[PDB]
C-alpha cells in the first residue's frame, strides 16, 4: 500500500507475488516529469518510489542457472540522494537485500 522496508517489501513479494503499488517504474516517474540529473523523486512524483525495474544480473553476485532473471526495487527512498539501499529478487523469488548498492548481498528469502 505504502510499504518501503526490506522486510515489508519482501513480505509483499512472497505473499501477493508482486511488488506494492507504491513503486512505479523509471519510465513512469519520467513521464511525471522526474529527471535523474535533477533532485529527488518525491519532489516531482510524490508518494512514489522506483521499483519493478530490471536488474539483469551478469551472473556473478547473485546466482543464475538456465537463465534466471532478476528485478530490483528501492528501499527507503522518499527524499535525499538517489536510492542506494535496495532489494533484488529473482523470477522464482529468491530474495536478497543490500545497503551497499550491489557490492555485497544477503539473503532474506
From Swiss-Prot:
GO terms for cellular component: extracellular region. It is an enzyme of class 3 (hydrolase). Its main location: secreted. Transmembrane segments: none annotated. Keywords: Endonuclease, Hydrolase, Nuclease, Secreted, Signal. The keyword Transferase does not apply. GO terms for molecular function: RNA binding; RNA endonuclease activity. The active site is at residues 72, 101. It comes from the Bacteria. Its EC number is 3.1.27.-. It is found in: Secreted. This is a purine-specific ribonuclease. Belongs to the ribonuclease N1/T1 family. This is Ribonuclease. It comes from Bacillus intermedius. The chain holds residues 54 to 162 of 162 of the full protein.
Amino acid at each position: 500500500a505504502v510499504i518501503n522496508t526490506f522486510d515489508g517489501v519482501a513480505d509483499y513479494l512472497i505473499r501477493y507475488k508482486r511488488l506494492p503499488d507504491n513503486y512505479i517504474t523509471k519510465s513512469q516517474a519520467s513521464a511525471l516529469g522526474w529527471v535523474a540529473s535533477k533532485g529527488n523523486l518525491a519532489e516531482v512524483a510524490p508518494g512514489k518510489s522506483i521499483g519493478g525495474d530490471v536488474f539483469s544480473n551478469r551472473e556473478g553476485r547473485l546466482p543464475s542457472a538456465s537463465g534466471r532473471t532478476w528485478r530490483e526495487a528501492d528501499i527507503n527512498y522518499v527524499s535525499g540522494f538517489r536510492n542506494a539501499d535496495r532489494l533484488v529478487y529473482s523470477s522464482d523469488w529468491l530474495i536478497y537485500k543490500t545497503t551497499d548498492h550491489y557490492a555485497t548481498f544477503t539473503r532474506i528469502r
